[PDB]
Design a protein around this ligand. Sequence first.
Ligand SMILES: O[C@@H]1[C@@H](O)[C@H](O)OC[C@H]1O
Length: 404
Amino acid sequence: AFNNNPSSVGAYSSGTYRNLAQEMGKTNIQQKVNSTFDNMFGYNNTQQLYYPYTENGVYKAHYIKAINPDEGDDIRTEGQSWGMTAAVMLNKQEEFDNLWRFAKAYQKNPDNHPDAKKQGVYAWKLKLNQNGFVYKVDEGPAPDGEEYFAFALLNASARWGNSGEFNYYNDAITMLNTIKNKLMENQIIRFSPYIDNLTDPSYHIPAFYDYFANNVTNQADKNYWRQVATKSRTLLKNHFTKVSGSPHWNLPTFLSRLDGSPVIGYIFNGQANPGQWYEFDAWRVIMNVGLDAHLMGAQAWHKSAVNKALGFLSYAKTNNSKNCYEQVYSYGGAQNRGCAGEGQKAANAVALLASTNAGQANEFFNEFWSLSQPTGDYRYYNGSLYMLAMLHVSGNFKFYNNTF
Ligand SMILES: O[C@@H]1[C@@H](O)[C@H](O)OC[C@H]1O
């Protein structure tokens, strides 16, 4: 049965990981997780997201392909880092190494870039040119990519050691220093190096920062990352307070100020959507809250955040002519951007690790578990989240500490 009373003590401290799918009475759980990875990482052109990159017939590395029917396929740091994360959780070293080799070679901006703000950060959008060779479309970062890269690299060090192709640990510490030096304002993750007083709630994964703190080897840095963790929980708590009730109706938003206030409308040239939309990034917020509750312990704010967000989505579904909740809301109003897809349902299933409502759990969990693995033209974002959620709901998303 669903555990509707999640522990205040996290799995990171106790070593006890929940298996949500098992709580929900499912069977063949590990087989389903394993086939999800195999199909995402297999050469089937169906669920597949993991593709080789070759130059003049010489194999180089692999990438997570951000398939995109509207704008042309591209390659993103988020997807790359998520794929590495999935690989390390399932002990898939070759896949991990192939993805990391690509990131370090082709996504990383040089340390001597003329713009100091870009030095060592990872260009968020690459493409293959008309001759098949990789190039950077946009050198600016998507900072949760660097967050996941650091996380994944620290875990790779812990599981596999540092005497193979990569010194994962050194690569991870380099990544953490890049985050600190290039991607932080006042210990809050930036949306952009070029804009102050701006964060993206979906980038806040407080438990990652606690894991970073336990995996650095100097006291100042340990304290730094613990403080980032506390400030991240504060930001999320504040954001959830600010989106409660009217006018945001309990869904977190794309962009926020450092006090948690949603950003209203457009604020910069190039911005893809209004700041106050619950959109694709925002989907991940309650997933991250579930993650944090599971790994570091459920507090009242985690439970309220998820219970109210899921409650809104259920209500919104009852007020939808398609009998679905949608992908994009603004001020509690549907924006007609489609019924929830697999990735949104996956994010919401992970959020259940902070839920106290068994009825909600039954519904959101079963809506995820009944899905087939994403295929087709929208599978990048749906399929990447589906993979992560499969790990989270099967007890496979674990923190592996390094030993000093
Ligand atoms: O995310 C959606 C996806 O699940 C679907 O398959 O295609 C339409 C998208 O908007």
